[PDB]
Write a protein that binds this ligand. Structure first.
Ligand SMILES: [Cl-]
Ligand SMILES: [Cl-]
Ligand SMILES: [Zn+2]
Ligand SMILES: [Zn+2]
Ligand SMILES: [Zn+2]
Ligand SMILES: [Zn+2]
Ligand SMILES: [Zn+2]
Ligand SMILES: [Zn+2]
Lengths: 332, 332, 334, 334, 332, 332
């Protein structure tokens, strides 16, 4: 089967309007909540939106059997004020994801957002983590830049600021899925910021003692590791002057395959190996456009991996299902 | 013939000491200048330092015939105060490079730093550009982040803030070589910051009308374009609703080959083509370490390109000399 | 006839979702626009949602014949960045109000938001004003605090920073309707901030030369003037050594009747007179809760005014009808 | 008897000069202190200065028997630096009020300033409170905005930041009299800022648990509650889904009658009742200008209340006398 | 005769209370003004205040025939907001000084404050200068730090920011009397800040081209030049490496003698000469305390100068009257 | 015997280059260290540079037998970021000084810099103080302005912020030598800033209870106490209402004689007495210029003190050796 480890929820429009209202009244109306029926939640999974077809229909067309769906990260407003609206919105998105996966369990598997508020101790996400565990969530999006490309930044991922979360994630045996959210920069919009933040996050993890202190910590880096597999040589070289090689820490990391060129997919898999690659596509999303020279949708990338002749059938099964099943603790 | 388009000056210690002193008295002692003889400058290009051998000796070992040497970018302190020390130090570095190229002209071709001060109009670098042109300089390092990963940032490269510079570069028919400088971030040290800034600079140039307005502008992006050749699919996808595709603007750009894995070199060349790649190594530098699996230096990357069977001899001559001769206007 | 001069649009949920997305991609996806059908715009004006009933049904239940609808002010994010999303959202709201009034012209009359970006010169709202004039809009919400209770504030309304806008309003002979937007304060939420800002705006206009320099400028102050009619004595007292008395400039202002107690409505009308009061209710909205004493919504305030013995039937026609017709340039319609 | 619960000290010029010098040397000359004789303190309460007549003569002309005098709030510079000059000045003002009330006890009753420094924990005012208690003070001015309309603001009055103060006030059984101080805004000068801050403070207290947690806390809101009695409807409406209604917490508050129009006084008393209104005038001060319609000062508001037919003579005794006696713990004196 | 060029007004207490009220209402009451009778103004000149005797009586006791009285600088609040209160207060102080000198012309000569608002162009003081000229004022206190030891500072005195004032002062042929005002520092209170600011101001004037561009500019530096005459050697030495000697610019400057030790007075006069020293005492003020070992008031410093045996009678006449008569254009 | 208590290390260029590099990579390269041989260090102490002769040769010319050498304060960058480079650079300077004193022990006695980081608790310099004590250091430079004339300042020296340091200094019975470092001001360059900071530091110490609480604390104020001996009268006057007089606290302080005019040297010695003056010259440095009226170097000031007829031979021995032997605990 094909399990896509990187999708984002197709939600009723009510969800995004709830965000706008929270921001407008800043909590003066209280928490309230998203009011949508089960029927509206299902309808949202079939609605075209800005894509060539509905979310469910696209996954069928591409041969994807199941997809792990998480919040749309660019909406999660981790730098917004007041803090409570960040928490409330994150909670409502997760609840909506839970409902949709309960209504469409044949296709969608829930992955949670963390209510990271820029500057708050990381322990402030633990209550929502626990609620999500109880709801059957299988992982958590981890944002290395809750400041959303502002004047300030958070500590690097090797900093002890993050250690309470790594400890909890190991206790749960659930993964962190590195994913930045928004960007306040006119130079780097959010879709580019994703990549730069994946690069910084991966670099931090491969030049610190995180995996010495948390040998079982499971981290999936989005978008084939940002720049890292392409730029690995220079960071490996610089690490020869140091304690442990960059590559020896990088070996601990998982990477998803959200890359829309064959050459990039080849380099990722040849660099980190089929044992550390999880098929993911972000479909529907950024890549849901047609190449006019081939007619293929750019985020229909499973065929590239199926056709790679340097991979065995066993390797392909790792990438398409077994790694996700292990990393996200998916049961038969 | 092998021409290495990306090297940084091996300078006598007196240069870096001049920087320290300038920062310490902030101009209260006057501009002054670096006081250093020629034997001292030559010695710098032969001194082993932390590398396995001297700068000249390494280039000989690797079969490099000539190298374009520019300032060491991480020393150029474009965010430092007061502004006059940034100008003065850049001018003194350019002068030292000129001396070293004159003293050792069988090897070194001069490329200039620009005295970019965070927040200053770009026209403030023109006087130095003119001086360097008079001295036979063949290009300029262009820093997209003179704020050096500070609380503020400069406008994106498509912003008219930069148009005066593109104008001058087209008048001179000389190239800009994209290279960031330092980084004030605890999360992103300068060696990582280089790559993220190349990604942003390239993204900005490929999603703006720069090459529509300056069809003849010559830009070389360092380090194989940051993340861009690896992450091209997602940015091409997003551009399909736009005046021009990301790839159509990217086709105007040149890239150097400062990449220390074979797979990354292959992906760069397959992505942009031999007609847009310039051999570069940054030797000596972060790559000047021994890969004990081979005994070879990591930045000795010419053999990788020489052994790619998908490239013709003509394609290899483009990468190793012809593109650089054209882009940097090198005379036989 | 009863014309309600203070209502805010009941918009399809797509409009607010559009705002959330603009803020999320910060305009990196381009301007785009709200994608809603005529059917969705009409349904929204009848949808029950947070109130006891739909927007149009409540106006029918209350005997309101027409209502001037403007943007929902607390959504207009005048302090948000980048500036372009403030402009774009304001334009989309105005376009949607035009469509809803076009689709339901027996009920709704269009009043425009201004794309006020904190810190920008006021002339940056003129292009959108001209577009709204072309679309038939009859007035403009004017926000004295586009900084939305932030660390900084705009100049007072008497400052020459605003004079270009007053000039244009006089050229058009169209009113400004004073209305603050959101509030970044934890002490002062937006529904309270409205009142305080109305008080400041009114105070500025009555202690400056605006009406000396723009005698025909038409200004309607929301919510019965914030605190001013109640606190008028202290401001009048301190004005006695100035060019004109506070009351002499205040006589130029119009005031809407969005007040939900009988005693406050009585004080408003006795203070400024029926010649300067425009019936307004903000229904549906803050006042859309059942008053236990009457079994009716608190924003069903028309009967209080109709039953005031100290007003003539002509006075009541001014409040319910004639003043809005004059101030908002309403032609013979229905 | 008529007790005016809202007056501010008429101090010798030396007190204000002392403030200027503290600010100038920023405490580098040490704390020092105001140097004034008993004679200078007495003369100041009779000096004409900016008003039509002396402080005591006006109270006699108006038939006020006694007045509770507190600091002049707009001089108390709660946002000034360094913090020590705020404390020192507050202490000197309180000492001077004690002396003036000691020297003229048939006229003046002491009410204290709190040395609120923007950003300091509220417990830093406790030492001075204890000293004022020892000196016979009968209440405390409480400033909800010690930041004085700056870039920052204090927590709302419902925040636990203030709970230590409410506890102490209940221990002492003495009231807080809500009063803002100066304002750094060019839009909102201090006389207007007073009103807006009273509105926020009242709103905070009526939408929080303060009176649930401190049922015997005594709070008097200056200037008839800012905007609140006039704007009560909208706040009541939005409170219907909360622990208690806005009006249910508002019933705990007392309000002074510093309002200079008859219609506003009528609305105040009809809204909160005579059981919660304390006569106050702020004479001499903002209202100390001749009302042309009466030939009397605008702050001569006692006759308006005395002539309200809808109040019993007992009601008027509550407003003029009994409420202040209960709230400020005034014993049988004169 | 003895003319004391450095005194500060003994004003009715109403003046300082007016400042407190301006600050309290921030102009919301309008400008208003100080309301005091001629009799109150005279009384203030006879009142002891915090001193051993009244202002007039002290000058009589010390043998001072006339004194130039200026605003009390530590009250002038040049960093206060809003700007208009700085201007209004300065104007009221100057008007009060004018009235007192008109009422007591046998003793007091008027010197004006400038309404310098931190950050305002210096041209904003010219209107008050003109009013003061019309009132017969004979000089102006010049504050080199209107920011009053804040986070920011004004340009050095050689900066062209100040050139419009130097031009006006030469047009009027009236002097600037360097005097700082308040200090927002817990480390340097105002009485120490005076000295440091005199040092900086003098240094700026002796290391710039001010006296080349304004050869006739008359500047009296308060308190014997801060640190400069004592520290002159090091600044002279450093200037030998430069254009003009520190001493050659310093020769253009006048200095008052507000120094309360004999040794300091000797050093000042031996360093700059009797031709550039103007007797001043600041009496009543900081020095109006009794030395318990001699019973002499510390600011009774004329006898020290009268008794110096290295000065001729002509020199002493320069210091005690002739220099002030020339510098402040005092007519017989 | 002449002991010069105020000299700054003549260091090989490699030291200042190490500073530049540290600032450039901000620790991303590791702490590293200065790499320099002994011939290079000796050569530094003999190299002419910009002076009329080498450091050692000048001291011989002037009759100075030994000099206490400390860091060059204007290089110590106490306001620089990140904090670790301030610590590392201070440590490397102290190590180099130790090497040079060991290599040239007939001349140089070691005095340490403190790794003061603006805003850090003073206890953060104790580890380095201990290390320097173990290495035989005889004193410490104390910077009252680690913020280097920035927007913020440190607490005054009487503040308990500094009491831990005074405690340690009394435990070690070692002195603090007051010396500011750099200055970020365009108005006050560092050579002027030194003097203003000495004035403030001395004022703070003489108007606080430091010497009441640490009667044995040894403090040497550079440059003859800034302005203080010249401006003493006004500060004594203001102190007559205080627990102790300014002069009574000032009597505990020592002053070095780095003053380059005869009159200033005389005023210092007459003001504080021979028992509190330590000969110092800062040679070579800002005073190493030829006064062409004599041909003598401005910082050759020993002859002035030798020829003062108001001092006994015993008084001169105090100034030239005995006070320094006692204050810096020098062994015979
Ligand atoms: Cl509203
Ligand atoms: Cl009041
Ligand atoms: Zn994603
Ligand atoms: Zn490079
Ligand atoms: Zn409204
Ligand atoms: Zn009051
Ligand atoms: Zn003075
Ligand atoms: Zn030194």
């Amino acid at each position: 089967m094909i399990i896509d480890c990187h999708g984002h929820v197709s939600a009723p429009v009510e969800l995004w309007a709830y965000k706008a209202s929270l921001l407008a009244h800043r909590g003066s109306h209280g928490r309230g909540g998203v009011k949508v029926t089960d029927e509206q939640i299902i309808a949202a999974a079939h609605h075209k939106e800005t894509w060539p077809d509905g979310h469910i229909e696209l996954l069928h067309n591409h041969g994807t059997d199941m997809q792990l769906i998480s919040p749309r990260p660019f909406q999660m407003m981790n730098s917004a004020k007041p803090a409570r609206v960040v928490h409330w919105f994150c909670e409502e998105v997760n609840t909506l994801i839970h409902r949709q996966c309960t209504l469409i369990p044949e296709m969608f598997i829930p992955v949670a957002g963390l209510p990271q508020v820029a500057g708050e101790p990381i322990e402030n996400v633990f209550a929502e983590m626990d609620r999500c565990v109880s709801m059957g969530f299988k992982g958590f999006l981890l944002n290395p830049d809750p400041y959303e490309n502002g004047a300030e930044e958070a500590p690097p991922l090797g900093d002890r600021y993050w250690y309470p979360l790594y400890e909890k994630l190991c206790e749960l045996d659930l993964p962190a899925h590195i994913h930045a959210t928004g960007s306040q920069s006119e130079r780097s919009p959010y879709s580019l910021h994703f990549i730069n933040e994946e690069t910084i996050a991966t670099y931090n993890l491969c030049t610190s003692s995180v995996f010495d202190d948390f040998p079982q910590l499971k981290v999936v880096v989005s978008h084939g590791g940002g720049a890292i597999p392409y730029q690995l040589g220079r960071f490996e070289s610089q690490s020869r002057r140091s304690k442990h090689l960059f590559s020896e820490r990088m070996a601990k990391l998982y990477f998803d395959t959200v890359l829309y060129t064959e050459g990039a997919l080849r380099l990722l898999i040849e660099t980190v190996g089929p044992e550390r690659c999880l098929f993911g596509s972000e479909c529907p999303g950024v890549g849901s456009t047609i190449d006019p020279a081939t007619g293929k949708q750019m985020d229909h990338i499973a065929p590239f991996i199926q056709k790679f002749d340097f991979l065995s059938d066993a390797d392909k099964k790792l990438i398409f299902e077994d790694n996700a099943r292990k990393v996200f603790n998916l049961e038969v």
